[PDB]
Amino acid sequence: RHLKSGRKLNRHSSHRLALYRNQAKSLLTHGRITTTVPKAKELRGFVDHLIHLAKRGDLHARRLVLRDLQDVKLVRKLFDEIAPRYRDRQGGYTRVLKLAERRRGDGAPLALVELVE
């Protein structure tokens, strides 16, 4: 027994990280992302941080963000377009809404991971 602690899984470390890294990229790229509930929830916090460093905009934040999102252009958009969109918002730049119906293939329950507004 454990879970006395936090964070989810079902992949080894390097994979689990690489995962959040990709959803993040895909989310900042499209605004709305559809994935399974667990993956969606675990995403919210990881990207909220990324955007919060954007709000700073001091380069260090930039190079910190680039560590997870390697796409220079992506970050640019992140720092010039998405970031301002909040700047006054105190956290919670991410939204997650579960859809009805599941994958008629494995029955996985899906959800929405939206960039909020």
Where does this chain bind another protein (CB under 8 A)?
Answer: 1, 32, 97-101, 112, 114
What part of residues 9-28 is at the interface with Mg ion (CB under 5 A)? 14
Candidates 80, 81, 84, 89: give the one binding RNA (CB under 7 A).
89
8 near RNA, judged by CB under 7 A: no
**Residue 89 backbone dihedrals phi, psi, to 5 degrees:** -80, 130
Q: Which residue, among 71, 81, 23, has the nearest Cα to 51 in the 3D structure?
A: 81
Query: Which tokens go with 61?
Result: 């934040």
- Ramachandran region of residue 7, left (φ > 0), alpha (ψ -120 to 50) or beta? left
What track of x and - describes contact with RNA for positions 48 through 77 (by CB under 7 A)? xx--x------xxx-xx-xx--x-x-----
Residue 77 CB, nearest distance to RNA (Å)? 13
For residue 8, the Cα-to-chain-centroid distance in whole angstroms is 14
> What, of RNA, another protein, Mg ion, none, does residue 76 touch, CB below 5 to 8 Å by kind?
none
